Structure formats: C-alpha cells, structure tokens
Design an enzyme around this catalytic site. Structure first.
Site, PDB file in Angstrom:
ATOM      1  N   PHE A  18      15.638  52.499  63.718  1.00  0.00           N
ATOM      2  CA  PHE A  18      15.802  51.840  62.425  1.00  0.00           C
ATOM      3  C   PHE A  18      15.339  52.741  61.281  1.00  0.00           C
ATOM      4  O   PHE A  18      14.246  53.319  61.338  1.00  0.00           O
ATOM      5  CB  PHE A  18      15.010  50.535  62.388  1.00  0.00           C
ATOM      6  CG  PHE A  18      15.612  49.414  63.190  1.00  0.00           C
ATOM      7  CD1 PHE A  18      16.978  49.181  63.174  1.00  0.00           C
ATOM      8  CD2 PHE A  18      14.798  48.563  63.924  1.00  0.00           C
ATOM      9  CE1 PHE A  18      17.529  48.140  63.907  1.00  0.00           C
ATOM     10  CE2 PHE A  18      15.341  47.524  64.665  1.00  0.00           C
ATOM     11  CZ  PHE A  18      16.707  47.313  64.655  1.00  0.00           C
TER      12      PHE A  18
ATOM     13  N   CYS B 284      21.920  42.825  61.931  1.00  0.00           N
ATOM     14  CA  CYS B 284      22.776  43.994  61.811  1.00  0.00           C
ATOM     15  C   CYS B 284      24.250  43.671  61.626  1.00  0.00           C
ATOM     16  O   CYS B 284      25.037  44.608  61.462  1.00  0.00           O
ATOM     17  CB  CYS B 284      22.598  44.897  63.026  1.00  0.00           C
ATOM     18  SG  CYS B 284      20.987  45.695  63.023  1.00  0.00           S
TER      19      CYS B 284
ATOM     20  N   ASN C  72      19.806  53.702  61.947  1.00  0.00           N
ATOM     21  CA  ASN C  72      20.376  52.359  61.865  1.00  0.00           C
ATOM     22  C   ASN C  72      19.681  51.626  60.710  1.00  0.00           C
ATOM     23  O   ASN C  72      18.499  51.274  60.808  1.00  0.00           O
ATOM     24  CB  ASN C  72      20.180  51.665  63.220  1.00  0.00           C
ATOM     25  CG  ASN C  72      20.561  50.191  63.218  1.00  0.00           C
ATOM     26  OD1 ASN C  72      20.869  49.604  62.184  1.00  0.00           O
ATOM     27  ND2 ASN C  72      20.553  49.586  64.407  1.00  0.00           N
TER      28      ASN C  72
ATOM     29  N   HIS D  13      29.332  49.457  62.962  1.00  0.00           N
ATOM     30  CA  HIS D  13      27.877  49.448  62.861  1.00  0.00           C
ATOM     31  C   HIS D  13      27.271  50.215  64.032  1.00  0.00           C
ATOM     32  O   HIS D  13      27.473  49.821  65.191  1.00  0.00           O
ATOM     33  CB  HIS D  13      27.307  48.036  62.860  1.00  0.00           C
ATOM     34  CG  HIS D  13      25.814  48.025  62.888  1.00  0.00           C
ATOM     35  ND1 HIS D  13      25.053  48.464  61.824  1.00  0.00           N
ATOM     36  CD2 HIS D  13      24.941  47.704  63.873  1.00  0.00           C
ATOM     37  CE1 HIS D  13      23.772  48.384  62.144  1.00  0.00           C
ATOM     38  NE2 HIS D  13      23.677  47.928  63.382  1.00  0.00           N
TER      39      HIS D  13
END
Ligand SMILES: CC(C)(COP(=O)(O)OP(=O)(O)OC[C@H]1O[C@@H](n2cnc3c(N)ncnc32)[C@H](O)[C@@H]1OP(=O)(O)O)[C@@H](O)C(=O)NCCC(=O)NCCS
Ligand SMILES: CC(C)(COP(=O)(O)OP(=O)(O)OC[C@H]1O[C@@H](n2cnc3c(N)ncnc32)[C@H](O)[C@@H]1OP(=O)(O)O)[C@@H](O)C(=O)NCCC(=O)NCCS
Lengths: 390, 390
Positions: B209, B158, B336, B303
């Site tokens: 995710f 990530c 994400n 992020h």
C-alpha cells in the site's frame, strides 16, 4: 444509441417501508432511567438540566435497540468517556443492516414486484462503518442479485435523507428500468454515553435521538396498473449555510461517535432557509408561466433536528402551525432518527392523506419540500410533487 | 419539460490531476526500515517473509505521508496492536483532504475553467471518517460554490475508483451543464502497524500500500474548442463474486484500520473475471451489428491489488504481456494506492499515448476496461471509450 438507455419520467417513490426496535422508552421515564443506568444520580443539578431538556423536547417516546439488560452487561457504554468503539461497532455493524432489512422487506412487500427487479441499492447510516459495508450486508440478507449496483453512504448525519433522494433521482432517471432500493438505518448505540456537565450539547442528543430504519423503492416510468407512484422527485439542491463552521460536528473516536453542537443551529437554519427555498422555487417555477406556490400551499417534510429548529423555521417563514404537523408527529412518536426521519415523515404524510380522503398524497397540495439538515452546516432541499388520490 | 434539464452526450473525463506525499520510500530499503522502526529485527523468520513479499511485490517505490520522524514521535503506530485510532484520525481527517486539494487543483488547472463551474463533488477515501466529511473539507479548502452537490464515499476500499465513475456517470449525464469533481485520496497512516507473525495478511499491506490522490473533472457535452475529453464512460457494472465471503475484510478498530486478506483472492478474481467481461461486452456490443473487440484490442486500466492478481488475470484471459504495462508502471512507481490507483493509471495511459504518438488516448485502441476489486469480493467494471488523438 446510448450503450445504457436512460428513462423518461421523473424519479418516483413507489413504496415506503419502516422498521423500529421493539423496545419503547417513554420520555416521561427517561431522565430517571438514563441517570440511573449511567450511575449519575449524584449529579443532581445536571439531572435537573436534563429533565428540562426532556420536558421541552416534543418527544413522547423513542424506540431504542439498547435496553437496560444490554447496558448492564456493557458498562463501557454507560460511562461518559470510556474506550468502547470496538464494542459499539460489533453491535451496529450487525444491527444497522438487520433493522434496514426489516424496513426494506416492508417496502418490497408494498411494491409487490420481485426483489430481482431491484437494480441499485443506496444504504445510508450514521451508525458504524465496516468493509464490506452495510450495503453488502443488506444485499446478502435480502438476497438481492449479485450484480446490484450498491452505494454505502457512511457518516452522513441528519441531512442524509435528502442526500439519498438526490442520488437516487439520477440513478433512476439515467437508467431505463432501474429500480433503486434506498435504505436509511440509524441505531444510537454508536453514540450513547453517560452525562457530562461540561458537554451539555452531548446531553441534547440523549434527549432527542431515537432508532429506526426507512426504505424506499425509487424508479422512473412506473408500470401502469402494476406499480404506484406516491411522490415525484423534481428538483434537488444542497447548500453549506454561511458562517456555520463547527455548528454540528461528529467524530468517530475510540469512545464511539461524539457530537459537538453550537447553541444556535436553529438561528443559522432559520435565518438562511428562506433565501434557499425562494431560489429553489424560482428555478422550478421560472418566469418567462405559473408562479411558485406560497409556502403555506406546499406540503412540508422537514427533518426535525430538534423542536427549536422547527419553531424558528416556522416563525421566520410565516408557516401556519399545521404545516409541520406530520413532521412533529414523527418527532413525538420516534424522536430524531437522523437520516431515516424524513422518510418516516413522508410515510406519515401519505397515510394521513389517504385516511383523511384528501386530494393528493401531499395533504391535498400539489408541490412540496423535503428538507434535511446536518453537519456542515448542510441543507438538503428536494422539491417534490404529490400524486392525485382517487 | 423537465424541472432539471439533462445532458445528451456520454459522461467524459475532461481533466486528470494527481498528487502524492513528497517522501519517497524505496522498496529495497523498506524491510530494514520497517523492521527497524518497529523494533522487530529479532523476528528473523518474520522478516524473511516480509523480505520475500517485498522482493516479489513489483513495487520499486512508494510515496508515504508517514516518515521516520513521525513514527518515532508516535510510538503507538509502531506496535502491532495498540490503541491508536484517535491519533490516526487526527492525521488523516486533515491530510486526506489536503492531499486531495493538491490533486484537485492540478485537475482544475488542466481543465482551464473557473472552479465556480463545478456543480458536484464526489470524494472517496478508505482513510479516516469525520462529520462533516472529507468532501466538505475539500470543498472548503478549494473554495467551491456553497451550493456544490457533495457526496462522500467512505470505507470503500480498492474498488472505489470504479464506484466513483459509476456514480459520476449519472450525475454528469442527468444534469445539463453539470461538471463533477471526482477525488480519491488515500493515506496509509490509518493502517500502518508493527509486524505480527500470526497475521501475515497485515504484512501484505505493509509491502504493497502507498499514498496518493487523484482527481477528475467529469462532464457531458464538452464545450468545443474549450474543453477536451480524454475518455468516455459508456457502461458500468458491479458484481459480488461467488464463494468470496471474507476474501477481503477491513475493520475500523481502536487500533486503526485492520485488514483480513485471503490467499487466492487472485484465484477468485481470475476464475470469475472472464465471464463478467464477456457479459459486459455482450451488453455494450449486442447482436441483432459489430462484434465486441477481442481482449487484446482493448485498453486495460486494472486495479493492481497485487502482482499475483495481475499475473493470474493476464494468464486466464490470454492477454499479451504489454496490455497491463501502464497498470504495472503505476504499481511499480506508487504501489497500491487503493481507490486512487486506477485514476493514476488512466493518467499514465493517456500520457504514454500522447508521448508515443499512438492513435487514441487508450494506446490506439477504441474501447477499454477499467476494473476495481475490493471487499465483497466486489468487482467494479467500467467500459470506456478512448478519444482519437490529433
Ligand atoms: C434542546 C431543546 C429542546 C431545549 O429547549 P429550549 O427550552 O428551547 O431551550 P432552553 O434554553 O430552555 O434549554 C434547556 C437547557 O438546554 C440547554 N441547551 C440547549 N441546547 C444546548 C446545546 N446545544 N449545548 C448545550 N446546552 C444546551 C440550555 O442551555 C438549557 O439549560 P439551562 O436550562 O440549564 O439553562 C431545544 O433547544 C432544541 O430543540 N434544539 C434544536 C437544535 C438541536 O438541538 N438540534 C439537534 C440537531 S440536528
Ligand atoms: C506480491 C505477493 C504478496 C507475492 O509474493 P509471492 O509470489 O506470493 O511470493 P512468496 O510466496 O514468497 O510470498 C511471500 C510471503 O507472503 C505470504 N502471503 C502472501 N499472500 C498472503 C496473504 N494473503 N495472507 C498471508 N500471507 C500471505 C506468503 O505466504 C509468503 O510467506 P511464507 O513464507 O509464509 O510462504 C503476492 O502473493 C500478491 O501479489 N498477492 C496478491 C495480494 C493481494 O491479494 N493483494 C490485493 C490487496 S490488499
């Protein structure tokens, strides 16, 4: 004023270190060892084919992490096609950074500066993948500063020694004071498997691939009387060769890393390399002005993917036989160590040049070529300058 | 007199494109779909844990390549721990570059220049590996010049959206005329698996995710009245956080990509980020001279590993509640998406700034921060400058 100052001079190789596993397998012994340890001695015709491949390999010995003891303890590595990947990863996620650390420590010792002066790390391997990666593992083993800027180049294959220089050139040149630790580390435990008479190209790898790691310190503007440049990076190019889809494929499967080759990788490389090098040299030596050196006046650091590649490149470019001598010496003593191999050859060349009291680190020639070949089919070209000796 | 001429101005983002799989999965529906398709509805306490993870996820919807049809056709994906890797690779080695092509084509269309002017390619993915890699696949799908200088960043995780900018900065700045196509593409088919009550950390990914690809054109010295800069890259840093060994691990196994993911990752990130940013800002704005902007006068492209990371960073740094609005909007609408997420947020922020008629592409602020977090625990820090609007 830029928020990050850049450097002025060309990215330079300031040190080279190498490391190999201590176990040596002599090629004379390899067909019997390999067919015995894989329980394949009933495959007499296939063994005869493999004997011929080894006889023609131009490889006298290789260093291998895998030993008879490890192979006997781990039968899934000895079969042609058994689920293994987890076992192979367990090995190479540890051993690839460990071998890389040995090469890096040797480079750092020659360089002679504190490892705290390293600002960037590039770690290249074709052997295993993990998160965090082999770059993180190496940084921890070496004790690099926690703010070192890392890059892990996974699943690169045999052109990767060119790639790492192409990237290191820009890291070193665009960052004042940057010192880039470059490590290529390859361990064939990821691909070793038993023989199959319907996959003769996989047998090729069993005859040629060896283990090894190589490490560089790359930086611009070496400190006078403190650091020492051995080669300068001046021009880089990369090319996908035409009509080469599928020439060299490699897949990470549940059975480990598998390879799929075409039988005229040598023809594809040798038929296209002349046009690539002519264009590169024309860009480095433009008319407007000195002409390009001729091929036989350059020094050659060529990835020895196999002896047929070398022979056909030689033939098509009109190279005298001794141009590839340093390249063939590494192939003979280590086999094809994938991305690490060209840096071993770089080390061999500078050492021969010093020993024979030649005028430059590139066998007395001013300019030279480093060439990597691998999946794509990708050709990496780096134009190098040697450094004068004494 | 360089053999390769360098550029003068800061590496700049000249275009952003994004792409997602068309299948939209609403979070309110996901606990019942996921436990139903994995034959786990009898795991009542486990489903309650997952329900609360989804309820607190701050994700309203995600785009997923995987559909009910694909899952029912491939039951090894619906178990927690069954050998699947080859199947997953067969999907993502093809679909990750395909999705990247869609994002790249959008970026190239906005950029408005012929694709033959792309000189470099960086392809980043945490979903699958192959040789030749996803970079080669994307270059072939787009029809880039055969001489494009490629780089594939595999198994990054990530933080990779920061990494690709750190590398692209030096490619663009050290090479006159260079135009770098940067693609991050992520597809969770590599990690999807059934639920297991001894591995709640894996469930976390199932709640958070999503899939997506983002693409940039990065270059220095944009051509006046022809190209348009949106953000400038001015400073980069990378840090391994202390006491973070094992905080985020990811292994490519025979069962696919598996994650091990510590509680208080958020605490580790929020304990350390202030000192990292104070350090970075002090290097960009040194005293000898205007001071660093305050945190609340910067724009933030963070992020969104999960909402707890955002909440704890916001609290520890004293950020006003609207600083992370663009970040949280992408988390809400996409989940994400690993390395691609920060580039979606960069696109969201410039679009909000234009639509709301703010003074710069960074919501009216001159300077800003892009932050990636991932295995290491690694923090990638990029200090950006916005571009003034009209
Ligand atoms: C492998 C090599 C040493 C064999 O040497 P050679 O004598 O020049 O070629 P030969 O035709 O006698 O080959 C010996 C055997 O290998 C077989 N062989 C060679 N390459 C093969 C391939 N890619 N796939 C399948 N079989 C292959 C040949 O068919 C031959 O089998 P046979 O004796 O049963 O007919 C040589 O062909 C070579 O160096 N290759 C370079 C390209 C390469 O293999 N490099 C790896 C990549 S980076
Ligand atoms: C969104 C989310 C996961 C939060 O929900 P929350 O506010 O913590 O709410 P809850 O406490 O009900 O959490 C729901 C369940 O998730 C579990 N959980 C959260 N993080 C976990 C982890 N890292 N490992 C295992 N279980 C975890 C909780 O323990 C809880 O289950 P419980 O009944 O056993 O107590 C949250 O913890 C988050 O954002 N975490 C950051 C996750 C992260 O690090 N993501 C980055 C990337 S891959």
């Amino acid at each position: 004023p830029r928020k990050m100052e850049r450097a002025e001079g060309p990215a330079s190789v300031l040190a080279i270190g190498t490391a190999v596993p201590p176990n040596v397998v002599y090629q004379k012994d390899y067909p019997d060892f390999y067919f015995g340890v894989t329980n394949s001695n009933h495959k007499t015709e296939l063994k005869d084919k493999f004997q011929r491949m080894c006889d023609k390999s131009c490889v006298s010995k290789r260093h291998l992490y895998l030993t008879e003891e490890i192979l006997k303890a781990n039968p899934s590595l000895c079969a042609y096609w058994e689920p293994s990947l987890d076992l192979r990863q367990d090995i190479v996620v540890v051993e690839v950074p460990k071998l890389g650390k040995q090469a890096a420590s040797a480079a750092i010792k020659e360089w002679g500066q504190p490892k705290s002066k390293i600002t960037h790390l590039i770690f290249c391997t074709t052997s295993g993948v993990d998160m965090p990666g082999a770059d993180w593992a190496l940084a921890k083993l070496l004790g690099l500063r926690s703010s070192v800027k890392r890059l892990v180049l996974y699943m690169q294959g045999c052109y990767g020694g060119g790639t790492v220089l192409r990237i290191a050139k820009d890291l070193a040149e665009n960052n004042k004071g940057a010192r880039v630790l470059v490590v290529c580390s390859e361990i064939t435990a990821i691909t070793f498997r038993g023989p199959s008479d319907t996959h003769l190209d996989s047998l090729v790898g069993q005859a040629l691939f060896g283990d090894g790691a190589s490490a560089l310190i790359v930086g611009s503007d070496p400190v006078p009387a403190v650091e020492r440049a051995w080669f300068e990076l001046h021009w880089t190019g990369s090319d996908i060769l035409p009509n080469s889809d599928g020439a060299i494929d490699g897949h990470l499967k549940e059975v480990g890393l598998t390879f799929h080759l075409m039988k005229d990788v040598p023809a594809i490389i040798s038929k296209n390399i002349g046009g690539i090098l002519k264009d590169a040299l024309a860009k480095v030596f433009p008319a407007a002005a000195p002409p390009p050196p001729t091929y036989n006046d350059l020094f050659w650091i060529t990835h020895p993917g196999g002896p047929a590649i070398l022979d056909q490149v030689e033939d098509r470019l009109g190279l005298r036989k001794d141009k590839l001598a340093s390249t063939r010496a590494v192939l003979d003593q280590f086999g094809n160590m994938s991305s690490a191999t060209v840096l071993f050859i770089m080390d061999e060349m500078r050492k021969r040049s010093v020993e024979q009291q030649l005028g430059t680190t590139g066998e007395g020639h001013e300019w030279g070529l480093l060439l990597g070949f691998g999946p794509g089919l990708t050709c990496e070209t780096v134009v190098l300058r040697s450094v004068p000796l004494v």
